[PDB]
Design an enzyme around this catalytic site. Structure first.
Site, PDB file in Angstrom:
ATOM      1  CG  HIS B  41      -7.061  -6.111 -30.267  1.00  0.00           C
ATOM      2  ND1 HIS B  41      -5.984  -5.161 -29.808  1.00  0.00           N
ATOM      3  CD2 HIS B  41      -7.163  -5.980 -31.712  1.00  0.00           C
ATOM      4  CE1 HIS B  41      -5.113  -4.692 -30.831  1.00  0.00           C
ATOM      5  NE2 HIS B  41      -6.022  -5.057 -32.096  1.00  0.00           N
ATOM      6  N   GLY B 143      -5.766  -1.456 -38.982  1.00  0.00           N
ATOM      7  CA  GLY B 143      -5.073  -2.610 -39.775  1.00  0.00           C
ATOM      8  C   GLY B 143      -3.583  -2.959 -39.426  1.00  0.00           C
ATOM      9  CB  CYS B 145      -3.204  -4.365 -34.270  1.00  0.00           C
ATOM     10  SG  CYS B 145      -3.673  -2.520 -33.445  1.00  0.00           S
TER      11      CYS B 145
HETATM   12  C1  T7G Z   1      -4.316  -1.656 -34.468  1.00  0.00           C
HETATM   13  C2  T7G Z   1      -5.203  -2.536 -35.396  1.00  0.00           C
HETATM   14  O1  T7G Z   1      -4.892  -2.484 -36.586  1.00  0.00           O
HETATM   15  N1  T7G Z   1      -6.685  -2.811 -34.910  1.00  0.00           N
HETATM   16  C3  T7G Z   1      -7.036  -2.292 -33.723  1.00  0.00           C
HETATM   17  C4  T7G Z   1      -8.347  -1.465 -34.156  1.00  0.00           C
HETATM   18  C5  T7G Z   1      -9.309  -2.404 -34.942  1.00  0.00           C
HETATM   19  C6  T7G Z   1     -10.453  -1.572 -35.162  1.00  0.00           C
HETATM   20  O2  T7G Z   1     -10.974  -1.226 -36.261  1.00  0.00           O
HETATM   21  N2  T7G Z   1     -11.214  -1.330 -34.180  1.00  0.00           N
HETATM   22  C7  T7G Z   1     -12.206  -0.166 -33.590  1.00  0.00           C
HETATM   23  C8  T7G Z   1     -13.400  -0.681 -32.792  1.00  0.00           C
HETATM   24  C9  T7G Z   1     -14.207   0.172 -32.473  1.00  0.00           C
HETATM   25  C10 T7G Z   1     -14.052   1.513 -32.860  1.00  0.00           C
HETATM   26  C11 T7G Z   1     -13.007   1.971 -33.567  1.00  0.00           C
HETATM   27  C12 T7G Z   1     -12.085   0.968 -33.762  1.00  0.00           C
HETATM   28  O3  T7G Z   1     -10.859   1.395 -34.384  1.00  0.00           O
HETATM   29  C13 T7G Z   1      -8.747  -2.529 -36.033  1.00  0.00           C
HETATM   30  C14 T7G Z   1      -7.357  -3.642 -35.772  1.00  0.00           C
END
Ligand code: T7G
Ligand code: T7G
EC number: 3.4.19.12
Lengths: 304, 304
Positions: B41, B143, B145
């Site tokens: 992702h 951040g 993930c």
């Molecule tokens: C878990 C992690 O560090 N991530 C996954 C989420 C993304 C992110 O910012 N995605 C996102 C997209 C649309 C709405 C909310 C949201 O958190 C960052 C990396």
């Protein structure tokens, strides 16, 4: 989201742990620059620990009696001195993995990570608090003495604890890295009882803030209180008195959540008076007091 | 003495964390040999995450779009492939700090350490369990993930988890290091509800053994039970059925304490039926189920 009892990453401290042997006693030492720090009781036989005279016991010890091993490699001891309850073993090699570090003496209520070690080898890492009675509630078997407690500020390890003693009640006592015991404890096998283990009120409030931030809100109520009214209730429940300094420290969490500190005090008052009624807060059935305000902000903002 | 929720020392894993950026998304990657593992992702915009077609999204990505940074130093990406829900970024440099490692898929009830990271930088370490509903109860902000879960067997890191997803209920879902989700979860922003979070009965019993070993014995009673009788009570309280396999696994703790497993089952039955009556066990007001039998023996014997 989610809120866990979280230790600092232990890598920088793992790089500092050595084995110290004196006669038949093996425990842990902390190697920073060309100095290995360890509990002075490394020089005691079982029998000595009843009423040790450390200056007299030390006269019988030379540099070559302190066996210091980092992994599989022996370090050469070129000097030894006693500072309070720690020995400082001077070695001929600076630890190449020495991080930026400070020696700090923490106050009761402050939290830190412990790297439990046996024979200079890390076994695990957990979060502790210096209790108001100057004990810590650790996990330490024989061989774990010289294990240290620390905080990390970005790249600088602040060492605050070295493990020395288990009290008959199964709680723990130790020193800062200048070898001064926290509280009234001594490195003697004698009658030493811990005082009242009071709850760290400002940490409980910080943790209630962490709960609200993370969606656990069932304990918020329609009430407020004052410091003096809250403190009557704190007294009755063996909670530390809440000061304006504690209120000021909670200001950022207040601002973030929009919940006045005294309103959160009123929540805590009801929890103390009414209990949890079989409910949980951040997966706990009791009021957690080993997160500082700084810990909550750190974990809730993702500092590295 | 004392018994703490204890993570593995994180040093060996700290040496493996990098930053991965694709377009505007920054998360963490695991660098082992010349491969960086990260959640697929990383290639999604916010908008994509509603119904991503990862094969189609990936066609628009070249090696040079995957920015991999270990500390301050950039790694050169010379290949990229999708395996299930992870990306494998081939880099031109083997991680010099690669530990001995395995990729293992754990079963529900098994515990592991998480090194929470942000921008490739370790923030903290905590102990988790794979829940019977294949969620974990973590601490993960934006951040985080690509943060991994692991066990250490002496010098060999068994990687079991990579963090991908927060469910609307604030619980966590992720993959093994082959990129296969635990449980039925998908890397899509969709209606995904966790099933019943049942209690890991064999872990509760292990922890009751740890309590007795460490002096907490008030809950021992004059009763015994059978697997079938106990399991009637387990069913009613959303506890996992106890199997003869669980009984056999608890054998060493039985032998050490001299308390028959079924007698400890009878203790647990009374605790479930009668509650704690405002008492604690190893400083908890609920029955802890994130210590495996192996964890209890490890911590109670001091393995490194
Ligand atoms: C878990 C992690 O560090 N991530 C996954 C989420 C993304 C992110 O910012 N995605 C996102 C997209 C649309 C709405 C909310 C949201 O958190 C960052 C990396
Ligand atoms: C904390 C630690 O690792 N220590 C301190 C205790 C000694 C030790 O074995 N001392 C001892 C003497 C006499 C009776 C019991 C007892 O534990 C090992 C190092």
């Amino acid at each position: 989201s989610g809120f866990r009892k979280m230790a600092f990453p232990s890598g920088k401290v793992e790089g500092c742990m050595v084995q110290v042997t004196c006669g038949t006693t093996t425990l842990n030492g902390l190697w920073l620059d060309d100095v290995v720090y360890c509990p002075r009781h490394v020089i005691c036989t079982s029998e000595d620990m009843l009423n040790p005279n450390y200056e007299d016991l030390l006269i019988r010890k030379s540099n070559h009696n302190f066996l210091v091993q980092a992994g599989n490699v022996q370090l050469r001891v070129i000097g030894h001195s006693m500072q309070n309850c720690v020995l400082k073993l001077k070695v001929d090699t600076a630890n190449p993995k020495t991080p930026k570090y400070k020696f700090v003496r923490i106050q009761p209520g402050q939290t830190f990570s412990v790297l439990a070690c046996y024979n200079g080898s890390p076994s695990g890492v957990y979060q502790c608090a210096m209790r108001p009675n100057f004990t810590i509630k650790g996990s330490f078997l024989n061989g774990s003495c010289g294990s240290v407690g620390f905080n990390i500020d970005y790249d600088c390890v602040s060492f605050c604890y070295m493990h020395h003693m288990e009290l008959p009640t199964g709680v723990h006592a130790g020193t800062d890295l200048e070898g001064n015991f926290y509280g009234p404890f001594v490195d003697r096998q004698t009658a030493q009882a811990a005082g009242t283990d009071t709850t760290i009120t400002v940490n409980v409030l910080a943790w209630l803030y962490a709960a609200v931030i993370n969606g656990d809100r069932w304990f918020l109520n329609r009430f407020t209180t004052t410091l003096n009214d809250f403190n009557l209730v704190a007294m009755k429940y063996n909670y530390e008195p809440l000061t304006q300094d504690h209120v000021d420290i909670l200001g950022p969490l207040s601002a973030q959540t929009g919940i006045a500190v005294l309103d959160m005090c009123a929540s805590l008052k009801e929890l103390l008076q009414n209990g949890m009624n079989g409910r949980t807060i951040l997966g706990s059935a009791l009021l957690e007091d080993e997160f500082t305000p700084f810990d909550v902000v750190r974990q809730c903002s993702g500092v590295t």
